[PDB]
Amino acid sequence: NSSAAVSRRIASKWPRPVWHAPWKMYRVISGHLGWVRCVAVDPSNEWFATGSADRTIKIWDLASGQLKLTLTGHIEQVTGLAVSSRHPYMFSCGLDKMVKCWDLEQNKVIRSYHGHLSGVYSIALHPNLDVLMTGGRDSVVRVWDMRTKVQAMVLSGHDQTVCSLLAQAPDPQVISGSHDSTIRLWDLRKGKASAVLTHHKKSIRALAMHPHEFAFASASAENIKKWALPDGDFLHNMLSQQRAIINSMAINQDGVVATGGDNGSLWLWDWRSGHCFQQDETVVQPGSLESEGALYDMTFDMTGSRLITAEGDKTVKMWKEVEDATPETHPGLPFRPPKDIKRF
Amino acid sequence: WAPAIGGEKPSVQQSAKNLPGHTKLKFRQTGQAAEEELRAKDLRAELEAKERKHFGKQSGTDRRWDDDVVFKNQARGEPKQQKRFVNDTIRNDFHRRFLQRYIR
Amino acid sequence: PIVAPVKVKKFETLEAEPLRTHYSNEFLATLMANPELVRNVAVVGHLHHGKTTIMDMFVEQTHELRKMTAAQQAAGKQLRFTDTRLDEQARAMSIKMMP
RNA sequence: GUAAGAGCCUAGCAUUAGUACU
RNA sequence: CCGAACG
RNA sequence: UGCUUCGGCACAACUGUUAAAAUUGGAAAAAUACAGAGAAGAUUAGCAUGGCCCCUGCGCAAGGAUGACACGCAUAAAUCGAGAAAUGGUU
Numbered sequence: 001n002s003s004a005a006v007s008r009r010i011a012s013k014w015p016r017p018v019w020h021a022p023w024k025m026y027r028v029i030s031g032h033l034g035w036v037r038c039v040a041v042d043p044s045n046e047w048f049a050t051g052s053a054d055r056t057i058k059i060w061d062l063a064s065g066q067l068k069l070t071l072t073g074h075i076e077q078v079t080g081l082a083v084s085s086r087h088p089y090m091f092s093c094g095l096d097k098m099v100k101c102w103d104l105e106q107n108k109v110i111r112s113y114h115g116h117l118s119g120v121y122s123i124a125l126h127p128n129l130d131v132l133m134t135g136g137r138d139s140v141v142r143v144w145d146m147r148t149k150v151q152a153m154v155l156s157g158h159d160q161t162v163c164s165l166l167a168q169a170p171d172p173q174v175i176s177g178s179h180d181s182t183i184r185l186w187d188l189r190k191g192k193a194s195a196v197l198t199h200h201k202k203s204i205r206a207l208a209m210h211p212h213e214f215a216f217a218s219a220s221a222e223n224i225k226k227w228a229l230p231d232g233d234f235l236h237n238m239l240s241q242q243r244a245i246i247n248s249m250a251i252n253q254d255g256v257v258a259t260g261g262d263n264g265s266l267w268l269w270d271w272r273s274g275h276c277f278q279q280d281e282t283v284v285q286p287g288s289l290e291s292e293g294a295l296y297d298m299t300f301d302m303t304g305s306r307l308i309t310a311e312g313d314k315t316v317k318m319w320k321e322v323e324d325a326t327p328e329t330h331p332g333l334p335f336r337p338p339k340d341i342k343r344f
Numbered sequence: 345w346a347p348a349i350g351g352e353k354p355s356v357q358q359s360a361k362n363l364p365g366h367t368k369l370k371f372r373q374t375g376q377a378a379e380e381e382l383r384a385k386d387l388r389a390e391l392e393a394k395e396r397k398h399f400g401k402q403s404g405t406d407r408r409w410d411d412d413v414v415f416k417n418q419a420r421g422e423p424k425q426q427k428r429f430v431n432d433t434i435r436n437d438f439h440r441r442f443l444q445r446y447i448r
Numbered sequence: 449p450i451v452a453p454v455k456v457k458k459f460e461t462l463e464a465e466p467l468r469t470h471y472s473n474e475f476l477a478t479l480m481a482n483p484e485l486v487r488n489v490a491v492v493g494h495l496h497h498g499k500t501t502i503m504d505m506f507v508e509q510t511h512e513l514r515k516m517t518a519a520q521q522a523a524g525k526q527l528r529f530t531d532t533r534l535d536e537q538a539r540a541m542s543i544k545m546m547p
Numbered sequence: 548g549u550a551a552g553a554g555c556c557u558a559g560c561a562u563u564a565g566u567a568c569u
Numbered sequence: 570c571c572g573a574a575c576g
Numbered sequence: 577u578g579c580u581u582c583g584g585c586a587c588a589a590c591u592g593u594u595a596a597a598a599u600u601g602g603a604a605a606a607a608u609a610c611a612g613a614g615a616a617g618a619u620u621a622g623c624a625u626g627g628c629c630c631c632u633g634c635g636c637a638a639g640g641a642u643g644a645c646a647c648g649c650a651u652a653a654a655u656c657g658a659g660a661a662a663u664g665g666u667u
């Protein structure tokens with residue numbers, strides 16, 4: 001219609017925020033010797049893996065936070081981690097240009113996916129095919145046969161580092177976000193972008209799918225946008241700006257969107273209304289700089305009740321819902337609908 | 345300043361690392377968190393169970409020879425050292441111990 | 449392992465269905481229900497003096513296991529029916545009595 | 548003193564298509 | 570035990 | 577060659593990148609002569625980066641002067657408006 005017309009529609013009909021209980025940080029785990037950069041939860045929900053700038057992958061007990069195992073095989077930072085839901089496999093990528101399949105029955109690297117020309121930044125397992133997708137500084141999403149280690153496909157078109165990656169079973173089966181400020185939705189059968197989304201002004205460092213809805217969120221240093229699938233229809237911006245580079249985004253089944261800032265902020269938003277009900281800043285562990293405070297990864301556990309964050313003060317932090325909270329004792333940041341008339 | 349971009353008869357040069365290996369995939373069986381096995385359970389029950397177990401079962405509750413000597417009691421007052429993580433490159437304890445060990 | 453392999457717990461691996469015999473199930477069910485056609489016998493001897501093999505010859509004459517025998521003389525070993533535990537097997541020794 | 552290349556002359560690898568008259 | 574290339 | 581009513585049937589079925597050539601062109605090398613080596617004073621170890629540069633190598637090694645090149649020599653005008661003053665037209 002217009003920006004004015006749509007702004008009046010928006011003042012009338014914006015979905016109100018669903019009340020979400022606040023989250024509190026209940027656990028710091030020290031022990032990585034570099035920035036914790038990636039997290040991944042195992043589908044059983046009993047351990048998580050964190051990769052680091054100290055080049056290791058640590059396996060942690062999800063309920064005690066206990067170091068179960070350290071895995072060394074990367075030469076540089078571990079930048080991405082993906083635990084398979086269908087295979088007893090963990091996948092890691094790293095700044096060493098290397099993608100590794102870890103056999104979790106051996107605790108050993110059994111396959112290596114060779115071919116990234118620069119450091120690898122993002123990883124994604126196809127949820128239904130035995131295929132993995134990695135993006136890196138060579139601006140390219142490399143699509144790998146899990147079994148034969150073969151590079152089945154190269155998704156070309158981005159211009160800078162592919163920083164975020166999504167994989168789903170419906171079309172578009174790969175979503176990438178890049179430092180070139182675009183999101184490509186890919187047709188995995190054709191090897192071609194099915195859509196290029198140019199609404200972001202900064203680089204898209206975080207993508208997240210909605211667990212249940214056909215929609216994803218992308219996050220920049222400037223906005224978190226929400227997009228409808230298959231075609232990547234812009235739904236909306238979050239109703240506030242985390243004034244931070246967002247490194248990580250996780251979405252819950254309750255629709256809690258967690259976004260984690262390069263400055264160590266953690267904002268919790270209502271998916272579906274776009275409204276942030278919580279805003280936190282990290283505390284950095286003793287010794288750290290407060291410059292060294294970013295929030296590089298976050299995942300929810302499989303139930304959605306825990307959020308594990310991988311931080312630049314080299315900690316894993318764990319957050320649980322203060323779910324003994326009720327919309328009366330704990331509403332959080334309160335909502336004013338987007339009443340403005342603005343230009344879009 | 346700018347990396348190489350990595351876009352994609354076939355060449356018949358065969359690498360050694362590209363010879364067949366691990367030619368079948370392991371799948372998660374019944375007992376290794378397989379997807380059909382995991383819909384069946386309440387993972388929140390097991391998580392809150394394990395967290396309560398950990399958090400409670402870590403809490404554990406439901407004149408002499410030394411008369412000319414000029415200094416007495418000089419160890420008393422010394423700090424007993426602690427298992428702590430300092431996020432400092434050079435001011436952590438591994439490093440202080442390392443430099444103590446290797447520099448004489 | 450971080451994902452424990454779901455292992456065949458190789459203790460003593462038997463076969464997955466009652467085998468073919470020269471009699472039925474109900475025939476033995478009959479011959480059991482009357483004391484005057486049942487003899488209980490333990491077989492004993494020295495070490496190796498032929499006990500396991502005699503029991504095996506009985507099995508060989510009253511059952512259906514010929515291609516088993518072909519697998520035995522192709523693999524190069526003679527059968528040991530009552531020596532079932534594959535660790536009592538690989539010592540050519542009966543370790544625990546079996547009925 | 549490396550040893551690189553530019554060129555000059557002379558300098559033996561690949562190819563099987565094409566040749567008309569108001 | 571045991572030898573070749575390269576730098 | 578069988579079978580043959582000796583008339584004939586049956587069977588068997590399309591090689592050749594067609595050259596002992598003809599051109600035809602492009603090539604590495606050799607000599608010659610040219611000229612003849614990173615970094616900041618000098619002398620020197622390298623490891624990179626980028627790609628219509630390759631060579632040696634089985635190479636996802638390693639090497640080739642850190643293999644070379646590039647590498648800036650920025651005669652890359654990165655360039656212009658503010659105001660007073662003063663002078664010019666017109667009344």
Ligand SMILES: Nc1nc2c(ncn2[C@@H]2O[C@H](COP(=O)(O)OP(=O)(O)OP(=O)(O)O)[C@@H](O)[C@H]2O)c(=O)[nH]1
Nearest residue numbers: 493494495496497498499500501502540541542543
């Ligand atoms: N020459 C000969 N050897 C035999 C005969 N029967 C069995 N054997 C051999 O004797 C070996 C030992 O006999 P087993 O079948 O082990 O009988 P066993 O005496 O119960 O031995 P244990 O199992 O140790 O008690 C076998 O492996 C055969 O090679 C036979 O009639 N003649």
Ligand SMILES: [Mg+2]
Nearest residue numbers: 576622623639
């Ligand atoms: Mg070297």
Ligand SMILES: [Mg+2]
Nearest residue numbers: 576639641642
């Ligand atoms: Mg050298």
Ligand SMILES: [Mg+2]
Nearest residue numbers: 622623624642
């Ligand atoms: Mg080098």
Ligand SMILES: [Mg+2]
Nearest residue numbers: 638639640643
């Ligand atoms: Mg080299």
Ligand SMILES: [Mg+2]
Nearest residue numbers: 620621641642
């Ligand atoms: Mg040298």
Ligand SMILES: [Mg+2]
Nearest residue numbers: 624642643644
């Ligand atoms: Mg070089």
